[PDB]
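Rotation project, supervised by the postdoc (A.L.). Task for the rotation student: set up a whole-complex structure prediction and record inputs and outputs verbatim in this book. Inputs entered:
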Amino acid sequence: DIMVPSFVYNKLPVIHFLQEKRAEQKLRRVLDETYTEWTEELDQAHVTDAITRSLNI
Amino acid sequence: REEEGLPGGPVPRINWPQEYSSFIDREPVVAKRIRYDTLASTTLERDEKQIES
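Outputs recorded:
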């Protein structure tokens, strides 16, 4: 009725602070894993060159 | 250009009357004319519906 309740009350602020940091840590890691991915596609000039060769030019 | 009617393919900026005088032998000049006249008579275009698909 008295003792355990008081010590639970004492624990609340630190646990709240640590869990807020843990949540921020998760969000930070989520952002850090994001990285714009640029793709490379076959240049059309080689297509235009193969087109020309096929013509027997 | 297609609406106007000009050749679809690129055309170089050449003056073949000068090239004939420059070169001694006609064979390379005639070959160049054949290549460019064939190039200017072809449409270097592909279907960018099928390509995108």
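Student's summary: Chain B touches chain A through six residues (CB under 8 Å).
Supervisor addendum: The two ends of chain B are 27 Å apart (CA to CA).
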